[PDB]
Ligand binder design. Structure first.
Ligand SMILES: *[C@@H]1O[C@H](CO)[C@@H](O[C@@H]2O[C@H](CO)[C@@H](O)[C@H](O)[C@H]2NC(C)=O)[C@H](O)[C@H]1NC(C)=O
Ligand code: NAG
Ligand code: NAG
Ligand code: NAG
Lengths: 106, 228, 102
């Protein structure tokens, strides 16, 4: 019976405007919008940049996500950044894997 | 011998993607095999009326037609006339009609709570706060298929109080009370000239109505990277 | 920027109605509200309908304004009925917030 209005994965939100029938008598049925949000509490400010500050503030204006300052890594998407590496004095760029679990070659 | 001409209305072409053309010259006596013309001043061809009886039983009829013009002709804005001759007036009678913008404002409102409380019927209205020009058309949808004409009524435009240049209207559908009680969504597809797709569709349902309860869980977890 | 209020009138067989708006108990200017002609109801031709659209500033509607409506018509027991709406005219809309900290 749930109608999942929004499932934005950056600003994790699961607004479900599920209708609930009231008791045995209809015509007073209640409508409820369950904004289930999972604040990460640990993700960095610029989530793709690990060296950025920590998120001490989480704005969830529901108007924007109904229709970006990304917070939570999406399952399918891979967030990564280049890293410097030194082995014998050579500084070689290479891509990283900030979410290795979902970033296997597929 | 009333003489009048019906200009093509863009409201009509959005409904059927076709142009129906017939001039209107009423209150003329009986004429056998009536044949009337339609020639814009720069020389379009002549066409007679169709699907109109040449002599109605009442003897006070209107037998005069318009040539089938494409929508591009009215997009051009050229002039147009029906020239009518009959026994009553040998002198031909000619009348000239032509078309003389802002994004339409189309947001509807749901039924009141007390309407559903009465448990008799319900009223859903496709209010339009403002549009330009005046011409506009409203049609109601259900389950993606057109609704019957008898249910919905469309009101003519009125000038906006603070923006007399802007014009507003409304349409009403008297739907059953119990039908609205269940989750059946409707769309009041309107038709306006000043639109990108030339047609606007907006829908509502009980799920779109006023909510009461909000049990936002707003979970806070150290599990940060993965969503849910 | 603005607020639109529609006063639904439904079911006057005499087909004669005159709507007004009395905001804070005094009638408002006629030009503010515009009413529709009494065309027959779809469900029952004997019945008719009309609206009244009062455009007002959004902030004013957001600050405790009654925006009362009246209907002058014969069949009513006192010949007049009044209705009004504000922020809280609807149902209470209790919240159910939860805040898990696991
Ligand atoms: C900081 O956030 C910005 C976006 O707000 C991002 O910067 C760019 O992200 C794209 C995405 O692939 C990269 O290709 C660019 O190289 C980034 N910019 C620069 C200057 O490198 C990114 O999320 C964050 N920036 C960095 C450097 O990680
Ligand atoms: C919302 O209220 C209902 C009772 O109406 C209750 O069962 C439910 O647990 C509440 N939601 C919460 C606490 O998230
Ligand atoms: C919100 O309330 C409904 C009751 O209608 C309940 O079924 C649902 O589980 C609640 N939300 C959560 C996250 O438990
Ligand atoms: C909270 O939600 C509603 C509103 O007060 C109430 O009916 C319900 O029993 C409450 N439940 C919890 C777990 O707080």
């Amino acid at each position: 019976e749930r109608i999942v209005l929004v499932d934005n994965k950056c600003k994790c939100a699961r607004i479900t405007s599920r209708i609930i029938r009231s008791s045995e008598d209809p015509n007073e049925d209640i409508v409820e919008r369950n904004i289930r949000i999972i604040v990460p509490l640990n993700n960095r400010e610029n989530i793709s940049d690990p060296t950025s500050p920590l998120r001490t503030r989480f704005v969830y204006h529901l108007s924007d996500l109904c229709k970006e300052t990304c917070y939570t890594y999406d399952r399918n998407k891979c967030y990564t950044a280049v890293v410097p590496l030194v082995y014998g004095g050579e500084t070689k760029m290479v891509e990283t894997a900030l979410t290795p679990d979902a970033c296997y070659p597929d | 011998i009333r003489v009048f001409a019906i200009p093509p209305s863009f409201a009509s072409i959005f409904l059927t993607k076709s142009t129906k053309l017939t001039c209107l010259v009423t209150d003329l006596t009986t004429y056998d095999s009536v044949t009337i013309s339609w020639t814009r001043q720069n020389g379009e061809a002549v066409k007679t009326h169709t699907n109109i009886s040449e002599s109605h039983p009442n003897a006070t009829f209107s037998a005069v037609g318009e040539a089938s013009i494409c929508e591009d002709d009215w997009n051009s804005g050229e002039r147009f006339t029906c020239t009518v001759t009959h026994t009553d007036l040998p002198s031909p009678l000619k009348q000239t009609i032509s078309r003389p913008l802002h994004r339409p404002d189309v947001y509807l409102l749901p039924p009141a709570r007390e309407q559903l409380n009465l448990r008799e019927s319900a009223t859903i209205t496709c209010l339009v706060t403002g549009f330009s020009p005046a011409d506009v058309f409203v049609q109601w949808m259900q389950r993606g298929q057109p609704l019957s004409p008898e249910k919905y009524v469309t009101s003519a435009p009125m000038p906006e109080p603070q923006a007399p240049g802007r014009y507003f209207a409304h349409s009403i559908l008297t739907v059953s009370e119990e039908e609205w009680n269940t989750g059946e969504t409707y769309t009041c597809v309107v038709a306006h000239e000043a639109l990108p797709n030339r047609v606007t569709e907006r829908t509502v349902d009980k799920s779109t109505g006023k909510p009461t309860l909000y049990n936002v869980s707003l979970v806070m977890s150290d599990t940060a990277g993965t969503c849910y």
